[PDB]
Short mmCIF file of C-alpha atoms in Angstrom, two decimals:
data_model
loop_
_atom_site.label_atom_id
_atom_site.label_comp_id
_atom_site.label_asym_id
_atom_site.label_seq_id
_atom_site.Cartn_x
_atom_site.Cartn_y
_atom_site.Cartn_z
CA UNK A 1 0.00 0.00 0.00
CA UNK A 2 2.64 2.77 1.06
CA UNK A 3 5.73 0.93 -0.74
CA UNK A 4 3.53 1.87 -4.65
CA UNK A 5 0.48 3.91 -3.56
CA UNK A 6 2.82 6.49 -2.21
CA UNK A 7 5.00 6.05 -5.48
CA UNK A 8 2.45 8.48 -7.07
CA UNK A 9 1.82 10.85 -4.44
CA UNK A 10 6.03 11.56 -5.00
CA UNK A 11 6.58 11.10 -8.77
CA UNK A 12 9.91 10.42 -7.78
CA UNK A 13 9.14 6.52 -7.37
CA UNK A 14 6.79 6.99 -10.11
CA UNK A 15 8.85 4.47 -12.38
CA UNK A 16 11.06 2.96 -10.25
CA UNK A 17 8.38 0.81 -9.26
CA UNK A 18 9.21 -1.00 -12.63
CA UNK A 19 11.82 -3.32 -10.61
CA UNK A 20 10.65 -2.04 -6.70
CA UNK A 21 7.93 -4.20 -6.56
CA UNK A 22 9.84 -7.13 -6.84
CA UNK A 23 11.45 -6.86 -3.25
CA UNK A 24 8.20 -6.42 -0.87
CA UNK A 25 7.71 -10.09 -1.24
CA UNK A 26 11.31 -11.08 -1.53
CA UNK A 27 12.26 -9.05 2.09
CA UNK A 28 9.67 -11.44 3.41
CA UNK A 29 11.32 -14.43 2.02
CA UNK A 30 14.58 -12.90 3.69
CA UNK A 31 12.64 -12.23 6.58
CA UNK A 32 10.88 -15.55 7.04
CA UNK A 33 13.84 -17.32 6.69
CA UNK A 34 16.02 -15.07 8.78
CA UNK A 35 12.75 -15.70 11.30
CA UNK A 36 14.42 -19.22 12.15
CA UNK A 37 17.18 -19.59 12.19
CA UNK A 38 18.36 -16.94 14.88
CA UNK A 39 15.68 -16.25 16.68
CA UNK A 40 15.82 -19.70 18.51
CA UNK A 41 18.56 -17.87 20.78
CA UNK A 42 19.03 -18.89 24.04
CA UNK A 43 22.04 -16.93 24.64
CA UNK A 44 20.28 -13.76 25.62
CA UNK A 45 16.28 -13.18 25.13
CA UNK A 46 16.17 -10.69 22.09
CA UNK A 47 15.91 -12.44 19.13
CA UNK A 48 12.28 -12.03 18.11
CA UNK A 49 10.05 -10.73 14.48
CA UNK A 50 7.30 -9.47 14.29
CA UNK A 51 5.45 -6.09 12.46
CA UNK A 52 7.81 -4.40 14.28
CA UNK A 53 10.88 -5.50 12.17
CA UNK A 54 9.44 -5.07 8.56
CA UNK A 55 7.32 -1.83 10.10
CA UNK A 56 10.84 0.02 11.05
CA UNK A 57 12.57 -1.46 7.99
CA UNK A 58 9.99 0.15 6.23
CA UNK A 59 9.64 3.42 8.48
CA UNK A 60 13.55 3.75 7.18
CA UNK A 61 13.19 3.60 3.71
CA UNK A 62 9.86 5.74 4.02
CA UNK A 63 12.47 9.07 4.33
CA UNK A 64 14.14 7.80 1.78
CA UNK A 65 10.78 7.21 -0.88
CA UNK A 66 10.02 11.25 -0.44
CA UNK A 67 14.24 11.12 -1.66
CA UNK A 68 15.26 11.50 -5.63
CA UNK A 69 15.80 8.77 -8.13
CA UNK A 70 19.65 8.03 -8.15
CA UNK A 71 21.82 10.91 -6.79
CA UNK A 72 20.73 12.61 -4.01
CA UNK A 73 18.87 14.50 -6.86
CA UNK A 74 20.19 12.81 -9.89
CA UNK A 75 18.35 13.35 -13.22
CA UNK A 76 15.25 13.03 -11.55
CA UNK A 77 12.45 12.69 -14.09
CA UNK A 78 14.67 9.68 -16.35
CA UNK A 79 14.72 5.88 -16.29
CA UNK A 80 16.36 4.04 -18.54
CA UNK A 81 19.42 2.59 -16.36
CA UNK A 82 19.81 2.53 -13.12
CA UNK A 83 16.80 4.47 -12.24
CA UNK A 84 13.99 1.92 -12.99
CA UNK A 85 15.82 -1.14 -13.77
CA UNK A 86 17.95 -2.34 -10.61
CA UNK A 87 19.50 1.34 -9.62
CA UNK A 88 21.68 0.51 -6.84
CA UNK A 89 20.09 3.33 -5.30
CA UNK A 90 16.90 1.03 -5.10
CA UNK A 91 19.29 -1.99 -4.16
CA UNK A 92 20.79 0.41 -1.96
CA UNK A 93 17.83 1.07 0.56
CA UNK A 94 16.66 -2.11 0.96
CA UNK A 95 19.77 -3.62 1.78
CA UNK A 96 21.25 -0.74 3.98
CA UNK A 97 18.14 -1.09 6.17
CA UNK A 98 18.17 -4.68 6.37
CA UNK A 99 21.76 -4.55 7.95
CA UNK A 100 20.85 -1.76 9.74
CA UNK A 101 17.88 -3.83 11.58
CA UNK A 102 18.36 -7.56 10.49
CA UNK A 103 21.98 -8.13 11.25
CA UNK A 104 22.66 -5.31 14.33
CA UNK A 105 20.65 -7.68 16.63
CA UNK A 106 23.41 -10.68 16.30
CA UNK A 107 26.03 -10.94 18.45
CA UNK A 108 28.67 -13.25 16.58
CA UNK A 109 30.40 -11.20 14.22
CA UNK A 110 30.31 -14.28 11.62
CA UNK A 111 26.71 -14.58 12.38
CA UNK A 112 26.45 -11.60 10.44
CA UNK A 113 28.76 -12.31 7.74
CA UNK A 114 26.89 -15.27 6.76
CA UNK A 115 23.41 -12.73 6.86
CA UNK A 116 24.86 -10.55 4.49
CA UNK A 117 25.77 -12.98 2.40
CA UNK A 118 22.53 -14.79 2.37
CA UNK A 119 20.57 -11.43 1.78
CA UNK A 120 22.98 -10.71 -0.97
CA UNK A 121 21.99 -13.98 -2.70
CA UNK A 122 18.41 -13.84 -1.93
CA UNK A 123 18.36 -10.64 -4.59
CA UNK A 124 21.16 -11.93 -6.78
CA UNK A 125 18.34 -14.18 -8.76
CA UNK A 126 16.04 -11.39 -9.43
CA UNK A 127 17.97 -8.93 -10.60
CA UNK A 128 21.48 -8.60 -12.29
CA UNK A 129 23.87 -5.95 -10.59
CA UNK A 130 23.82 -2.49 -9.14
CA UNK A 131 25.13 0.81 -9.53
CA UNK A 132 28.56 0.44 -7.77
CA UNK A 133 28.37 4.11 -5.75
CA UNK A 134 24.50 3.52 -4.98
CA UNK A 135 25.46 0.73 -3.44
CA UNK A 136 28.52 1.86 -2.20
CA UNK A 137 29.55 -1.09 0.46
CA UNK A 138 28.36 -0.53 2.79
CA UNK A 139 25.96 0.90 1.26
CA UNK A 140 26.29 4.14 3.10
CA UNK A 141 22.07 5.81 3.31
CA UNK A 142 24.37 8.38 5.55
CA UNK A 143 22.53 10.60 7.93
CA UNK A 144 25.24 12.57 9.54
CA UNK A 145 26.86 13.73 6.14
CA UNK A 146 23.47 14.48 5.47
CA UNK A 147 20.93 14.75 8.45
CA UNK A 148 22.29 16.84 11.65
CA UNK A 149 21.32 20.19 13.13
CA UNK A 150 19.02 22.64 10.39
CA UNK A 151 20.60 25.03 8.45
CA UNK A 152 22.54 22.10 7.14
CA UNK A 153 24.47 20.12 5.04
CA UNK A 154 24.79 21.78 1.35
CA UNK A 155 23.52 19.37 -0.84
CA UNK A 156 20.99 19.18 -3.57
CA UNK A 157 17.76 19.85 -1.67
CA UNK A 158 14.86 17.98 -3.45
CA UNK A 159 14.04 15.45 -1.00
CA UNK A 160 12.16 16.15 1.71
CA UNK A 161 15.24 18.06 3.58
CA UNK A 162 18.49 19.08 2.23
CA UNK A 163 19.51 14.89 2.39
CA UNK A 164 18.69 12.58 4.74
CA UNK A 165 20.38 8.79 3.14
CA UNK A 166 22.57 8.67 0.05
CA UNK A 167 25.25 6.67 -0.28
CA UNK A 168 26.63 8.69 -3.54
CA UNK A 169 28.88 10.10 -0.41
CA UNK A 170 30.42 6.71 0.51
CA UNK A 171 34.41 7.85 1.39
CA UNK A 172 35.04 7.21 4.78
CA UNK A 173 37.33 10.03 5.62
CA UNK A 174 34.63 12.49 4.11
CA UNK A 175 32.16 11.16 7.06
CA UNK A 176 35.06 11.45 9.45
CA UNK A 177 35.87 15.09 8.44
CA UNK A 178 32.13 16.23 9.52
CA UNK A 179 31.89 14.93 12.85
CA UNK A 180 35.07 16.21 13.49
CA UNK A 181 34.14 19.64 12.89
CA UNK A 182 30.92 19.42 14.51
CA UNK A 183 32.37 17.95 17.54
CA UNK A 184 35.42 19.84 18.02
CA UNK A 185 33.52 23.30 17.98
CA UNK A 186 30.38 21.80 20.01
CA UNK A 187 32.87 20.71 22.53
CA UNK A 188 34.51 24.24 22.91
CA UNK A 189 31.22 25.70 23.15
CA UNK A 190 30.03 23.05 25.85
CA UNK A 191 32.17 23.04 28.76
CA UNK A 192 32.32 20.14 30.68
CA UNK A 193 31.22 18.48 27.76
CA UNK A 194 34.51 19.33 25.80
CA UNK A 195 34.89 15.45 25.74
CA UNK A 196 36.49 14.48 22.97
CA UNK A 197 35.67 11.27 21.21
CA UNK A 198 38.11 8.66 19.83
CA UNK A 199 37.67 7.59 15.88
CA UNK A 200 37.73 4.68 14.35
CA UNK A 201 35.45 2.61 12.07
CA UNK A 202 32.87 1.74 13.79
CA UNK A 203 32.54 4.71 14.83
CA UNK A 204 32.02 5.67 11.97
CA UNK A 205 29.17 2.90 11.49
CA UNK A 206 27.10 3.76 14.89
CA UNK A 207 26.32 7.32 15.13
CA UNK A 208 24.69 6.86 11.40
CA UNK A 209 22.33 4.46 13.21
CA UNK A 210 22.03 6.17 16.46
CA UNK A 211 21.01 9.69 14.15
CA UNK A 212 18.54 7.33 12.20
CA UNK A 213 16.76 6.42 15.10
CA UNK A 214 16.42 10.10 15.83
CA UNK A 215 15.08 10.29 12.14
CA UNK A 216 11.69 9.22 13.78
CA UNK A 217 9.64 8.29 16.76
CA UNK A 218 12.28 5.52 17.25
CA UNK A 219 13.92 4.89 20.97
CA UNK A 220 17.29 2.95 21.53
CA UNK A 221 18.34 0.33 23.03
CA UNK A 222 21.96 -0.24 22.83
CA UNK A 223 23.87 -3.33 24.74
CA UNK A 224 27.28 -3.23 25.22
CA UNK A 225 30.42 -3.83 27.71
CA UNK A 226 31.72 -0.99 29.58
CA UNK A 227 35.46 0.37 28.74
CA UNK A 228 34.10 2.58 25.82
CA UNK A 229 32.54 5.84 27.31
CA UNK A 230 28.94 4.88 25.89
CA UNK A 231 27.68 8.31 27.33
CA UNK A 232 30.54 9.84 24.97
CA UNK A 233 29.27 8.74 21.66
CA UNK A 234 25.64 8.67 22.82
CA UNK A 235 25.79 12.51 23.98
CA UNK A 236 28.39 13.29 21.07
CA UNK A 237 24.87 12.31 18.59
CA UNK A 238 22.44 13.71 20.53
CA UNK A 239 23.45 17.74 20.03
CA UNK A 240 25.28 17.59 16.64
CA UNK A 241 22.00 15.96 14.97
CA UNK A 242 19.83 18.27 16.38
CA UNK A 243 17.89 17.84 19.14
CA UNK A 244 19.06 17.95 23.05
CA UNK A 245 19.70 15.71 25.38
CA UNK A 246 18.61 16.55 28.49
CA UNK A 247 20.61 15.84 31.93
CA UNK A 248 19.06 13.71 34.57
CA UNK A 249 19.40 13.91 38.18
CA UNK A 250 17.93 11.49 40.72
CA UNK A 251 17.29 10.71 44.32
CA UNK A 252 13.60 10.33 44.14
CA UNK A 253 10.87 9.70 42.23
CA UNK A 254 8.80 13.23 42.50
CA UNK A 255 12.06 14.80 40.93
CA UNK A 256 11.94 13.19 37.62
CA UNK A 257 7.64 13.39 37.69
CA UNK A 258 8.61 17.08 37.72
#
């Protein structure tokens, strides 16, 4: 209903359809199949599916349907290549959300790279290839080279906001640059926040995610050993993507019911 009826409403997805389609049915046979053979976990108790997993994985490409055909603008009103026919860009969302929600809950890193694998596959019959840089691995829907704080981000504004997820921006160092200028000033301007955060791949790889749930009436839940200043890179997203964290103080429960 929203994956095609809302491919008219933005013309955008108007044609793209042509080869679109052909994935609504085919994340279920991912997700169906991915629906047994993890969740019978009992490691830890959070290996579950249900509308909540294809309802966010669809709530994250939704930003991304009011988005433009193949560059964060691209030609926009043309489809012969990859624009209709497998675009990459296409490609792109469905399986940057899938790792973003389908893979994240493992544990075992292996776990994972047999997931990717297997989701790579599952589309490798119905299609052919991809657009290289629309699918820029990993494919890269960024949203902190394009999403944070308003007034923001130069960059073909046709989607819904200046860019939200395109992975035409896939070079690593190029993410890296941005945080590091938003962080580095934010600090000097926040005191005792002046924290500075240590870089590295992944992080890299969270803060897209942690900025992606605040893309939406999404909450986090994030589970992980000590030894890594959590707070850091929780706070360090919170601010530079917008909105504001708020400190917390406690002794009592009237305190935080005011």
């Amino acid at each position: 209903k929203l994956v095609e009826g809302r491919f008219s409403r933005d013309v955008f997805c108007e044609e793209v359809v042509y080869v679109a389609s052909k994935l609504v049915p085919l994340t279920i046979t991912l997700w169906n199949r991915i629906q047994t053979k993890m969740l019978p976990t009992p490691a830890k108790f959070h290996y579950l599916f249900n509308m909540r997993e294809l309802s966010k994985v669809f709530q994250g490409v939704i930003l991304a349907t009011r988005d433009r055909f193949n560059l964060a603008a691209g030609d926009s009103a043309v489809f012969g290549g990859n624009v209709a026919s497998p675009e990459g860009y296409l490609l792109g969302l469905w399986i940057h959300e899938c790792r973003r929600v389908f893979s994240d809950k493992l544990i075992s890193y292996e776990d994972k790279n047999w997931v990717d694998k297997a989701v790579f596959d599952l589309c490798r019959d119905n299609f052919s290839s991809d657009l290289v840089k629309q699918v820029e691995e990993p494919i890269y829907f960024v949203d902190f080279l394009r999403e944070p704080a308003v007034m923001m981000r130069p960059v073909e504004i046709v989607t819904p906001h200046p860019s939200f997820y395109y992975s035409v921006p896939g070079g690593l160092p190029e993410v890296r640059a941005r945080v590091e200028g938003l962080q580095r000033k934010f600090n000097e301007e926040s005191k005792v926040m002046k924290l500075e955060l240590v870089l590295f791949t992944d992080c890299v790889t969270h803060l897209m995610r942690i900025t992606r749930l605040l893309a939406w009436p999404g909450l986090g839940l994030l589970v992980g050993v000590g030894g890594s200043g959590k707070q850091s890179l929780s706070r360090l997203s919170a601010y530079i993507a917008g909105p504001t964290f708020y400190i917390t103080k406690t002794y009592n429960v009237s305190n935080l019911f005011e």
